[PDB]
Amino acid sequence: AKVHGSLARAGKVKSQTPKVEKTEKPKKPKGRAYKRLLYTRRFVNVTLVNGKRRMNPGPS
């Protein structure tokens, strides 16, 4: 095949995606406390059961 194709466009997309800073948000607990949060989220209180169960929903 060909070997000497342009290199002009190296990093085209990364260089032209608009920066949006990370947001400043609540500090998530680390260690045992995080395993706690997961468990009250996943089993204790429960959220929905739209037929089954969802973990990362948005506009449903």
Binding site: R32, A33, K35, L38, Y39, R42, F43, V44
Partner: protein
Amino acid sequence: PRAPRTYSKTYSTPKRPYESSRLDAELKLAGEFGLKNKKEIYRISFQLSKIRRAARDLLTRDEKDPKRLFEGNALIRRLVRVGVLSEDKKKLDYVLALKVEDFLERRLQTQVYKLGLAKSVHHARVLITQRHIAVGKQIVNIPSFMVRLDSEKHIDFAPTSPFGGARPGRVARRNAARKAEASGE
């Protein structure tokens, strides 16, 4: 040129990495005994695994074969000692059963909670690491201490710390400092 220091690792990771049935099952335990790791469960499953392997082997030997009798009986009374093996079921075909949860419900972190004294496993953890609660006058700060039956009656707060006399504590005493240095002279 000196004797090697011997070590061993004390846990085992599950083969299938992403099996949600097992993953749910593991998390429930984590939040039911106040653990912080999948490893704290991985560990116990390993402890079990060998106890079972041990037992399996003995079972293949003849009823009342010398080794079977000696090491089997020994394995049982060790298990009875800490309260994983119930008294009735005491002849190894049940250790051959057993279960992860039986081992879990004997940790110090859980025994500290099981009879009052904490109310929530997480308070129970925090208490342990923070140098309160003891066995004799011997403070214990490892949540995995595995209460052995005959020390169960002795899980109480330490003679040090608040909660067991001794002293309030430097964050409270600091408040007793701002109390009479504001409202006094």
